[PDB]
Amino acid sequence: DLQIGFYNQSCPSAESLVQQGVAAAFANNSGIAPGLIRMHFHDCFVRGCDGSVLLDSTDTNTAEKDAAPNNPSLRGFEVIAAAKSAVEAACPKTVSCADILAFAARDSAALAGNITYQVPSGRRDGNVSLASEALTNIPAPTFNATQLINSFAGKNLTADEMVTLSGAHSIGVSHCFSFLNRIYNFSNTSQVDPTLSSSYADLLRTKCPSNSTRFTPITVSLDIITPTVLDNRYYTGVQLTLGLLTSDQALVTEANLSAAVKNNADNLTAWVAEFAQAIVKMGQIEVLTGTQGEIRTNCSVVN
Amino acid sequence: DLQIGFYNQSCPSAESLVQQGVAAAFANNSGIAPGLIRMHFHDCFVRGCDGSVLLDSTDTNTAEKDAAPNNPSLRGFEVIAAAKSAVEAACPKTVSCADILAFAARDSAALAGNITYQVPSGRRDGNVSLASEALTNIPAPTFNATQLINSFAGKNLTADEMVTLSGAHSIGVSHCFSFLNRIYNFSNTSQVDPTLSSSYADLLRTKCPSNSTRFTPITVSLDIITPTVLDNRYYTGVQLTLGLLTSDQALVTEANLSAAVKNNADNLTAWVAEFAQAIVKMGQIEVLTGTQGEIRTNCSVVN
Ligand code: HEM
Ligand code: HEM
Ligand SMILES: *[C@@H]1O[C@H](CO)[C@@H](O)[C@H](O[C@H]2O[C@H](CO)[C@@H](O[C@@H]3O[C@H](CO)[C@@H](O)[C@H](O)[C@@H]3O)[C@H](O)[C@H]2NC(C)=O)[C@H]1NC(C)=O
Ligand SMILES: *[C@@H]1O[C@H](CO)[C@@H](O[C@@H]2O[C@H](CO)[C@@H](O)[C@H](O)[C@H]2NC(C)=O)[C@H](O[C@@H]2O[C@@H](C)[C@@H](O)[C@@H](O)[C@@H]2O)[C@H]1NC(C)=O
Ligand SMILES: *[C@@H]1O[C@H](CO)[C@@H](O[C@@H]2O[C@H](CO)[C@@H](O)[C@H](O)[C@H]2NC(C)=O)[C@H](O[C@@H]2O[C@@H](C)[C@@H](O)[C@@H](O)[C@@H]2O)[C@H]1NC(C)=O
Ligand SMILES: *[C@@H]1O[C@H](CO)[C@@H](O)[C@H](O)[C@H]1NC(C)=O
Ligand SMILES: *[C@@H]1O[C@H](CO)[C@@H](O)[C@H](O)[C@H]1NC(C)=O
Numbered sequence: 300d301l302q303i304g305f306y307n308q309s310c311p312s313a314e315s316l317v318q319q320g321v322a323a324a325f326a327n328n329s330g331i332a333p334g335l336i337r338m339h340f341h342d343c344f345v346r347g348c349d350g351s352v353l354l355d356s357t358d359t360n361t362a363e364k365d366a367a368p369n370n371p372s373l374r375g376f377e378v379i380a381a382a383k384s385a386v387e388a389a390c391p392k393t394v395s396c397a398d399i400l401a402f403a404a405r406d407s408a409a410l411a412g413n414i415t416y417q418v419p420s421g422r423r424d425g426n427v428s429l430a431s432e433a434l435t436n437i438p439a440p441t442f443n444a445t446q447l448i449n450s451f452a453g454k455n456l457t458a459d460e461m462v463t464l465s466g467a468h469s470i471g472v473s474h475c476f477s478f479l480n481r482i483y484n485f486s487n488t489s490q491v492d493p494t495l496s497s498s499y500a501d502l503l504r505t506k507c508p509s510n511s512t513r514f515t516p517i518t519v520s521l522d523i524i525t526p527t528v529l530d531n532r533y534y535t536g537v538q539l540t541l542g543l544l545t546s547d548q549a550l551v552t553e554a555n556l557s558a559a560v561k562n563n564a565d566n567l568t569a570w571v572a573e574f575a576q577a578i579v580k581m582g583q584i585e586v587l588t589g590t591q592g593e594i595r596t597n598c599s600v601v602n
Numbered sequence: 603d604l605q606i607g608f609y610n611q612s613c614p615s616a617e618s619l620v621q622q623g624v625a626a627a628f629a630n631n632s633g634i635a636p637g638l639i640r641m642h643f644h645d646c647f648v649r650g651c652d653g654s655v656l657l658d659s660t661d662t663n664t665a666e667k668d669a670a671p672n673n674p675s676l677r678g679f680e681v682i683a684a685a686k687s688a689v690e691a692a693c694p695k696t697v698s699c700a701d702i703l704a705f706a707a708r709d710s711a712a713l714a715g716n717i718t719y720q721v722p723s724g725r726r727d728g729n730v731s732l733a734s735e736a737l738t739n740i741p742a743p744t745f746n747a748t749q750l751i752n753s754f755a756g757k758n759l760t761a762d763e764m765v766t767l768s769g770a771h772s773i774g775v776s777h778c779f780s781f782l783n784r785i786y787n788f789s790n791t792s793q794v795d796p797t798l799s800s801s802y803a804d805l806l807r808t809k810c811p812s813n814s815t816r817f818t819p820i821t822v823s824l825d826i827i828t829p830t831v832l833d834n835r836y837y838t839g840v841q842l843t844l845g846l847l848t849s850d851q852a853l854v855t856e857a858n859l860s861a862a863v864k865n866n867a868d869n870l871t872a873w874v875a876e877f878a879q880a881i882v883k884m885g886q887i888e889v890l891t892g893t894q895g896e897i898r899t900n901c902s903v904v905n
C-alpha cells in the first residue's frame with residue numbers, strides 16, 4: 300500500500316522541493332548523487348526504508364551511521380536536511396524522512412545517469428537505529444557470489460536484481476580500506492588478487508598504503524571506465540578484470556550472475572529499465588505505512 | 603629478395619638457437635618480449651631492418667639508441683647479444699644481426715601471445731646509425747591520427763596496418779614521460795586530457811610526479827586490461843578511454859581508424875592473422891640483401 304503521488308493533496312510541491320535541494324547540492328559536489336543512492340540502499344537493508352540510517356548517535360547508543368561500513372563513508376546528510384527543511388516550511392509534519400530519501404536517490408539517478416522513474420510514497424519514519432544491526436545487515440565487499448545472493452534473498456530480492464542493483468557502483472567512490480584485501484597480503488601464494496588487473500593493482504598500491512584504515516581519506520572511483528556516469532560500464536569493467544571490489548568481481552564467478560552481467564554490459568536501455576525497477580522494488584522493503592511510525596520533523600533525531 | 607629458411611643450408615640451427623636465447627631471457631623477465639618487438643620496429647623505421655639500432659655510440663657520433671625515444675626506453679640488447687654469441691659459435695660470420703632481431707621479435711610474439719608466424723630471412727647489417735635519423739623517423743606518442751598515418755605511409759604501410767601494429771601496445775610498458783602531456787598541464791581549460799579516464803588520470807598523477815623526465819624510472823603498462831598477454835584488449839581499452847598514449851587514443855578520433863579498432867577489438871583471430879602479416883611486412887622495409895652490407899660479427903659494433 301505505497302502510492303505514487305501520496306502527497307498529491309497534502310504536499311503537492313514536495314518532490315520538486317527535494318529535487319531542487321539535490322540539484323543545488325549536486326552542482327557544488329557531484330559526489331552527493333552516489334552518496335544518496337547508497338544511503339537509500341543502506342536505509343532499506345536495515346529495518347526497512349524507514350529513515351533509520353539518518354538518526355544521530357546519542358549517549359544512549361551508537362546508531363547505524365556510526366557503524367564501520369557507514370562511518371566515515373556515508374555522505375549526503377546535509378542534502379537530506381536541506382530538502383527536509385524546505386519541505387517542512389512548506390508542509391509541516393507531513394512528508395516523512397523515509398520518502399525524502401527515496402525521492403532524493405531518484406533525483407540522483409536522474410542527475411547522474413538520466414535515469415528517470417517514479418517513486419511510490421507514504422513511508423513513515425522509524426524510531427530505532429542500531430549500529431549492531433548495521434553490521435549484521437549490510438553486506439561487506441568481501442562477500443562471494445553466494446553470500447551476496449543470500450543477503451538479497453534475505454531482503455526478498457532476486458539474484459538478478461542483486462546484479463542489477465550492483466550497477467550503482469557505476470558511479471561513486473571507494474575508500475582504500477574497502478578493497479585493501481585485494482592488493483596487500485591476498486594469499487600465501489601472491490600479494491595481489493589474480494582476478495584484478497596487475498597494472499591496476501600496481502597503481503592502487505601506489506595510491507593506497509598498506510597501513511590504510513577505514514578512516515584513511517583516500518578514495519578511488521568504483522568505475523574506472525565512466526567514473527561519474529551511472530551507466531552499464533560497471534559491467535564491462537567487471538568482465539575485464541577491472542572490477543574494484545571483491546563483491547564486484549564476484550559477479551563473474553558464477554554462471555547465472557555472469558550471464559546477467561553480459562546482458563547488462565551488452566545493453567544500456569535494458570539495464571536502465573531494469574535498474575529503475577529494482578530500485579523502486581528496493582524502496583519498498585519492510586516499510587512503515589498508515590499510522591505506523593511518525594513523521595520525523597528533524598531527520599537526525601526522533602521526535 | 604627475402605626467403606623463409608635462408609639459413610636452411612648455411613646455419614640450420616639458427617632460428618632454434620635464437621628462440622632458446624629469447625626463451626631463457628623471457629622466463630627470467632617477461633619484459634624482454636615487448637622490448638624486442640619494439641626494437642624490431644625501431645630498427646625497421648630507420649634505414650630499414652638493417653640492425654642499425656643495435657650499434658653503440660662512439661667518440662665519433664651519437665647513435666640511434668642514444669636518441670631520446672630510444673634511451674633509456676629500449677631494452678633487449680643483452681638478449682640479442684646472447685643469441686648472437688650462440689649463433690656465431692655455431693656458424694661463424696653467417697647469420698646477420700638484422701635477421702636475429704626479426705627472429706627474436708617473432709619468438710617474443712609466440713611467448714607473449716601464442717602468435718606464431720614464419721620470418722623471411724636474408725637481411726644484411728648496415729654500417730650507419732645516427733641519433734638524428736632516429737629522432738626524424740620514429741613517431742612520437744604525441745602524434746595525432748593524421749601524423750601517425752603519414753609516418754607509416756612514409757614507410758609504405760597502410761593506415762589499417764598502422765592500427766594493427768599499434769596492437770603491439772597490448773603488452774609492454776611506458777615511462778611516465780611518454781604520456782605526461784596527458785595528466786599535467788594538458789590545456790588552459792583542464793589539467794588532464796578529457797579523452798582519458800578521470801579515475802585513471804588521478805591514479806597516473808599519483809604514480810607519476812610532474813617533475814618527471816624521460817630518465818625517471820617509473821613505468822606503467824600500456825594495456826591495463828591484460829598487461830602481459832599480447833591480445834586484442836589494447837583495442838577495447840582504447841575505446842573505453844583507457845588508451846594510455848596520446849597516439850593510442852588517436853586511433854578512435856578518426857572514423858576509418860575507429861572502425862579498424864572495433865574490428866580488432868570485436869574479433870581476435872582476425873586481429874592475430876593481420877598482426878602476423880603486418881609484422882612480416884614491417885620486417886621488409888628497405889632491407890639489404892645479396893652482397894649489400896655485411897654480416898656483423900658483434901651486433902654492437904661495425905666490423
Ligand atoms: C551488493 C552488495 C554491496 C556491497 C557489498 C557494497 C559495498 C560498497 C562499498 C564497500 C562501497 C565503498 C565504500 C567505501 O569504502 O568508501 C560502496 C559504494 C557504493 N555503493 Fe555499494 N555495495 C553493494 C551494493 C550496492 C547497492 C545495491 C547500491 C544501490 C542500489 C549501492 C550503492 C553504492 C553507491 C552509490 C556507492 C558509492 C558511495 C559514494 O560514492 O559516496 N551499492 N558499496
Ligand atoms: C604507432 C606509432 C607508435 C608510437 C608513437 C609508439 C610509441 C611508444 C612509446 C612512447 C612507448 C613507450 C616508451 C617509454 O616511454 O617507455 C612504446 C612502447 C612500445 N611500443 Fe610503440 N609506438 C608506436 C607503434 C608501435 C609499433 C608499430 C610496434 C610494434 C610493431 C610497437 C611496439 C611497442 C612495444 C612492444 C612497446 C613496449 C616496450 C617495452 O615494454 O619494452 N609500437 N611505444
Ligand atoms: C662486442 O663489442 C662490444 C663493443 O665493442 C662490447 O661491448 C661487447 O661486450 C660484450 O661482452 C661482455 C663480456 O666481454 C658480455 O658480458 C656478459 O654479460 C652478461 C650479463 O649482462 C653475462 O651473462 C655474461 O656471462 C657476460 O659477462 C656482454 O653481454 C657483451 N655486451 C653486449 C651488449 O653484447 C663485445 N662482445 C663480445 C662477445 O666480446
Ligand atoms: C497523483 O497524481 C497523479 C497525476 O497527477 C496520478 O498519476 C496518474 O495516474 C493516472 C491513473 O491513476 C495515469 O493514467 C497517469 O499516467 C498518472 N500520471 C503519472 C505522471 O504517473 C497519481 O496516481 C497514482 O499513480 C498511478 C501510476 C497509479 O498507481 C494510481 O493508482 C496512483 O494513484 C496520483 N496519486 C494519488 C495517490 O492520487
Ligand atoms: C572474424 O574475422 C575473420 C577474419 O579473419 C572473419 O572470417 C572471414 O570472413 C570473411 C567475410 O567477410 C570471409 O570472406 C573469409 O573467408 C573469412 N576468413 C576466415 C579465416 O574465416 C570472421 O567472419 C566470420 O566467419 C566467416 C567464415 C563468415 O561466416 C562470416 O560471415 C563471419 O562473420 C570474423 N568473425 C566474426 C564473428 O565476425
Ligand atoms: C536491448 O534490449 C531491449 C530490451 O528492452 C530491446 O528492446 C532493444 O532493441 C535492445 N537493443 C539492442 C541493440 O539489442
Ligand atoms: C536536528 O537534530 C540534531 C540532533 O541530532 C541537532 O544537532 C540539529 O542541530 C537539529 N537541527 C535543528 C534545526 O533543530
Ligand SMILES: *[C@@H]1O[C@H](CO)[C@@H](O)[C@H](O)[C@H]1NC(C)=O
Binds near residue numbers: 606607608609610
Ligand atoms: C627451407 O625449408 C622449408 C621447409 O622444408 C621450405 O619450405 C623453405 O622454402 C626453405 N627455404 C629455403 C630458402 O630453401
Ligand SMILES: *[C@@H]1O[C@H](CO)[C@@H](O)[C@H](O)[C@H]1NC(C)=O
Binds near residue numbers: 729894895904
Ligand atoms: C660501409 O662503410 C664502410 C666504412 O664504414 C665503407 O667503406 C663501405 O663502402 C660501406 N658499405 C656500405 C654497403 O654502406
Ligand SMILES: OC[C@H]1O[C@H](O)[C@@H](O)[C@@H](O)[C@@H]1O
Ligand atoms: O654486464 C654489463 C656489460 O654490459 C655491456 O654488455 C657492455 O657495456 C659491457 O662492457 C658490460 O660489462
Ligand SMILES: [Ca+2]
Binds near residue numbers: 342344345348349
Ligand atoms: Ca532503515
Ligand SMILES: [Ca+2]
Binds near residue numbers: 470
Ligand atoms: Ca559509469
Ligand SMILES: [Ca+2]
Binds near residue numbers: 645649653654
Ligand atoms: Ca635500422
Ligand SMILES: [Ca+2]
Binds near residue numbers: 827830831
Ligand atoms: Ca594485452
